Amino acid sequence: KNKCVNFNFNGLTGTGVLTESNKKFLPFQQFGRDIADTTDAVRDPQTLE
């Protein structure tokens, strides 16, 4: 976290910084999408944060 990386979650490849969100995802949700139809949040599958 807080470092620049080539992430992949579940096949959602990309490049970015990752950080501990405060976004109150309801328990069924896994992604947030930005206005631009581009993912901006993900719930880690091994450790649900």
Binding site: T19, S21, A36
Partner: protein, 49 residues
């Protein structure tokens, strides 16, 4: 007159995390669209006026 931006210092302290979901300006910047600042300030115009 109420403005979406004027080039007024975006430093990712605001634009990364919470506000990236709502501020039009953060989304533009994160997608490679930059508002540039005017050469004269709203003080410098007030001096000429």
């Amino acid at each position: 007159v109420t403005l979406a931006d004027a080039g007024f210092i975006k430093q990712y302290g605001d634009c990364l995390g919470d506000i990236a979901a709502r501020d039009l300006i953060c989304a533009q910047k994160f997608n490679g669209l930059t508002v540039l600042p005017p050469l004269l300030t709203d003080e410098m115009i007030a001096q000429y006026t």
